[PDB]
């Protein structure tokens, strides 16, 4: 009704500075590395709180800005928000175009979604001009341990990642979140009811890696992020690694694989949680860090307060 | 694809300037008129849209003017007919029985009146400060135009009711001396441009007390749009023409409301409260010897801070390179 149905309609302005600077951060080097972002990968979204709110008005938040469906579907299979030690996740709306995937992580990081492209583009170009035979190898030994013709069905995946039409786009694979979490060089963690797990940037030292996941969520065939709510109460800012079943870590090799605890311990910031007394490896999440000048979030949240007042 | 109004821009920024509104309203004790203390002296500009291909420079135009109303007042050859001074482009606003507000809150902030700010403020002064002289004003103009002394009573009470946010369109729609005490309250004249038409002179206040630039609207069907200057790349003069021209001769642009006393120096109180200028036109002979008067224009003078075009220009630029 009073409040737009996206975080970017808050400031279309700025909506655009972000999808301005965005392109220019990618760094496409010359000595055969993968293409990857200089700065924007380290941002990451926070949530308002919208708990202060008058329960008519709340819904009417949350109608906005939140996939309520998508939430209750992983609340309901007690995936997402499990744990009562950490802090709650919410679910935000994608456009479920083809590159929710795309989407989603844009989101996670920015607030705006990947209208210009910019992700996918970045996505295809790597996969046709870099040296793809190390991420072939992984596909291949994650795949076998899951009469075919390998470079046929390699030689496929690589074409769907492109923005020809086939759903506007292609729907993407496990292995274009391995790759897209090489080019942002951080890691990512699909949570799910295969394409759940553990996406690490094993293509770089984790020293040069930041070191806070991008959290998704996935039902149907749908992504959205997993966004915390900002700055609350005492509960820790943290995504439980095991559903007690640890989650997949997708793509390791089997020297990798026997160093898997020690991996997740380099690559994110691991911190016991206790459970009912057994304790649990979770990665610590990022705080909001995204600066005023392309805030979204602060600029919808005056928008909403503004618009509280003219209903109160 | 742009977006459909120039508040959409930057939503943020739209309510800063919401917010000031209302705590820039000083309601004075003594009964003087309710007034705004600062914001009344900004004015609003639109940006060149001539450095377009034309088939984008129709898809702004689609977005922010209302291409009708301003077709029919150049059509009926009273806005932008003097080829002297700079051309009004019409802004699209909301009918939803507010529109004189819409209108005149878009000329000097960017925003409409969605708040009823403007409405609110109209509606309060009647209620609450002296309205007497306004009531024997707008007798004697409606005299001009029998009637027992208990029905002006009843007529005036009845447009106070009007001017309120009660649902009678979404609200009532205002008459002339609505206009007439909306230039009051904002210290400074009026000038709508129609086939209403005429200048609304702030007269509850002494000029040296009032912001000498006009808010221009212009008035079609029954419906109000400001008339806003179009910024730069030309050498016309920043006006308007306080004449009509009507087969071949000058009538002067009625001003509303005024007394017998101030209807002899009718003249005299333009060049109080505007800032009057001879403006030359060409006549049957004698050279193109015939002047005109006209009343300058302000300049785009809202700042960065609450200034909406510059941020809608910036999203366009941004969406024609992307065209």
Same mark, same amino acid.
């Not at 996505?123 to 076998?144: A, G, I, M, V």
């Not at 295969?194 to 992504?223: N, T």
């Given at each position: 009704?009073?409040?737009?149905?996206?975080?970017?309609?808050?400031?279309?302005?700025?909506?655009?500075?972000?999808?301005?600077?965005?392109?220019?951060?990618?760094?496409?080097?010359?000595?055969?590395?993968?293409?990857?972002? /200089?700065?924007?990968?380290?941002?990451?979204?926070?949530?308002?709180?919208?708990?202060?709110?008058?329960?008519?008005?709340?819904?009417?938040?949350?109608?906005?800005?939140?996939?309520?469906?998508?939430?209750?579907?992983? &609340?309901?299979?007690?995936?997402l928000?499990?744990?009562?030690?950490?802090? /709650?996740?919410?679910?935000?709306?994608?456009?479920?175009?083809?590159?929710?995937?795309?989407?989603?992580?844009?989101?996670?990081? *920015? !607030?705006?979604?990947?209208?210009?492209?910019v992700?996918?583009?970045?996505?295809?170009?790597?996969?046709?001009?870099?040296?793809?035979?190390?991420?072939?190898?992984?596909?291949?030994?994650?795949?076998?341990?899951?009469?075919?013709?390998?470079?046929?069905? *390699?030689?496929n995946?690589?074409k769907?990642?492109?923005?020809?039409?086939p759903?506007?786009?292609?729907?993407?694979?496990?292995?274009?979140?391995?790759?897209?979490?090489?080019?942002?060089?951080? #890691?990512?963690?699909?949570?799910?009811?295969?394409? !759940?797990?553990?996406?690490?940037?094993?293509?770089?030292?984790?020293?040069?890696?930041?070191?806070? #996941?991008?959290?998704?969520?996935?039902?149907?065939?749908?992504?959205?992020?997993?966004?915390?709510?900002?700055?609350?109460? #005492?509960?820790?800012?943290?995504?439980?690694?095991?559903?007690?079943?640890?989650?997949?870590?997708?793509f390791?090799?089997?020297?990798?694989?026997?160093?898997? &605890?020690?991996?997740?311990?380099?690559?994110?910031?691991?911190?016991?949680?206790?459970?009912?007394?057994?304790?649990?490896?979770?990665?610590?999440?990022?705080?909001?860090?995204?600066?005023?000048?392309?805030?979204?979030?602060?600029?919808?949240?005056?928008?909403?307060?503004?618009?509280? /007042? /003219?209903?109160?």
């Amino acid at each position: 009704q009073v409040l737009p149905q996206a975080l970017y309609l808050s400031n279309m302005r700025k909506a655009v500075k972000i999808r301005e600077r965005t392109p220019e951060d990618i760094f496409k080097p010359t000595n055969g590395i993968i293409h990857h972002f /200089k700065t924007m990968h380290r941002y990451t979204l926070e949530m308002f709180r919208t708990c202060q709110f008058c329960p008519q008005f709340r819904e009417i938040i949350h109608k906005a800005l939140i996939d309520r469906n998508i939430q209750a579907t992983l &609340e309901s299979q007690k995936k997402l928000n499990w744990c009562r030690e950490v802090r /709650k996740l919410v679910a935000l709306k994608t456009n479920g175009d083809g590159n929710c995937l795309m989407h989603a992580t844009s989101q996670y990081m *920015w !607030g705006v979604q990947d209208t210009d492209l910019v992700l996918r583009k970045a996505l295809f170009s790597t996969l046709k001009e870099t040296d793809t035979r190390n991420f072939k190898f992984r596909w291949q030994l994650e795949s076998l341990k899951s009469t075919r013709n390998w470079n046929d069905e *390699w030689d496929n995946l690589i074409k769907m990642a492109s923005t020809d039409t086939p759903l506007q786009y292609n729907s993407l694979e496990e292995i274009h979140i391995f790759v897209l979490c090489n080019i942002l060089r951080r #890691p990512i963690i699909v949570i799910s009811d295969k394409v !759940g797990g553990i996406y690490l940037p094993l293509h770089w030292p984790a020293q040069e890696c930041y070191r806070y #996941p991008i959290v998704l969520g996935y039902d149907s065939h749908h992504f959205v992020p997993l966004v915390t709510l900002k700055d609350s109460g #005492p509960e820790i800012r943290a995504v439980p690694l095991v559903n007690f079943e640890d989650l997949k870590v997708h793509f390791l090799t089997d020297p990798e694989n026997e160093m898997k &605890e020690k991996l997740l311990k380099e690559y994110l910031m691991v911190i016991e949680i206790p459970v009912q007394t057994h304790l649990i490896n979770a990665a610590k999440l990022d705080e909001a860090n995204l600066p005023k000048e392309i805030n979204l979030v602060d600029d919808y949240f005056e928008l909403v307060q503004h618009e509280y /007042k /003219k209903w109160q």
